């Protein structure tokens, strides 16, 4: 199928109306970031020639 970006949400804009929140949600989200790799060392002489 042709992908859909998101559901349409037409915001009810007018020159004299505002939307004020009456409540809140404390949301905890995860962010995973790589820091280091496996430290590898290669003996060039042994690898090429044994």
């Amino acid at each position: 199928y042709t992908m859909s970006l998101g559901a349409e949400n037409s915001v009810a804009y007018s020159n004299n109306s505002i939307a004020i929140p009456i409540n809140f949600t404390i949301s905890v989200t995860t962010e995973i970031l790589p820091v280091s790799m496996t430290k590898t060392s290669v003996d060039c002489t042994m690898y090429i020639c044994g």
Partner: protein, 50 residues
């Protein structure tokens, strides 16, 4: 099949038709002695950085 290594006793039970043993990387890490049908582990010699 030639190489250099430390030959120790092995707990791996080979099938009777199999002679050599390979790891994921297709390197011989287990072998069967031809004279006496016993399995030997081939541990690489302790090469290291100084």
């Amino acid at each position: 099949l030639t190489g250099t290594g430390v030959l120790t006793e092995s707990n791996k039970k080979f099938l009777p038709f199999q002679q050599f043993g390979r790891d994921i990387d297709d390197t011989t890490d287990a072998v069967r002695d031809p004279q006496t049908l016993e399995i030997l582990d081939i541990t690489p010699c302790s090469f290291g950085g100084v």
